[PDB]
Amino acid sequence: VLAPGASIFRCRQCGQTISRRDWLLPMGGDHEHVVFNPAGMIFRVWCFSLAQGLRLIGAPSGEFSWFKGYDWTIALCGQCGSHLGWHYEGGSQPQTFFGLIKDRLAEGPA
Ligand SMILES: O=C1CC[C@H](N2C(=O)c3ccccc3C2=O)C(=O)N1
Ligand SMILES: N[C@@H](CC(=O)O)C(=O)O
Ligand SMILES: [Zn+2]
């Protein structure tokens, strides 16, 4: 389409470019996964094949992973440090992907 407005995802706090709607990834048949951590926090996680602009912190862990076969690392906004989600690795088809917290991103034109 011409002049799309639902094209890219930026960090909600600072505007860093993070991902693209084209890169949404339907893990287990859905790009959206509603999940909770051990602290009881609920996240609406959108899975993306690719992302940029993040800083991945520490070494991977399999503990409490929401995605069978994958280990996670915390993904912060590389610009402002906002916690945007997790990077997943060590699994199969795909080996890696990103799970980003939908309400911590702003969607907009390319
Ligand atoms: O797949 C994941 C990513 C990490 C996530 N997670 C959290 O968000 C968290 C907060 C506090 C203590 C421990 C955890 C943890 O494993 C979680 O529970 N599963
Ligand atoms: N979508 C932008 C690229 C960006 O802002 O990251 C452009 O077409 O110039
Ligand atoms: Zn940011």
38-42 own/partner pairs: CB under 8 Å, 24+ apart: 38/64
- Ligand 1 pocket, residue 39 CB under 6 Å: yes
Phi, psi of 12 (to 5 degrees): -60, -30
Only one residue has tokens 């940029």, namely 52
Resolution (A): 1.5
Residue 7 and residue 24 in contact, taking contact as beta carbons nearer than 8 Å: no
Taking only Cα atoms into account, the Rg of the chain, rounded to an integer number of angstroms, comes to 13
Q: Which approach determined this entry?
A: X-ray
Pocket test for ligand 1, best of 34, 37, 104 (most atoms within 8 A of CB): 37
Residue 18 and residue 6 in contact, taking contact as beta carbons nearer than 8 Å: no
Residues of the binding site for Zn(2+): 11, 14, 77, 80
Among the listed residues 50, 54, 57, 39, the one whose alpha carbon sits nearest the alpha carbon of residue 98:
50
Only one residue has tokens 């996670």, namely 72
Only one residue has tokens 């287990």, namely 28
Question: In the structure encoding, which two tokens stand for residue 2, read together?
Answer: 């011409």
Ligand 3 centre from 76 Cα, in Å? Answer: 8
Residue 5 and residue 109 in contact, taking contact as beta carbons nearer than 8 Å: yes
Residues contacting 2, CB < 8 A, separation 6+: none
Among the listed residues 50, 45, 44, the one whose alpha carbon sits nearest the alpha carbon of residue 21:
50
What is residue 41's DSSP assignment?
Answer: -
Check the CA dihedral 72-73-74-80 and report its sign: negative
Residue located nearest, by CA, to atom 2 of ligand 2: 110
Distances (CA, A) of 68 to 11, 33, 52, 59, 77: 27, 13, 24, 18, 25
Ligand 2 centre from 8 Cα, in Å? Answer: 8
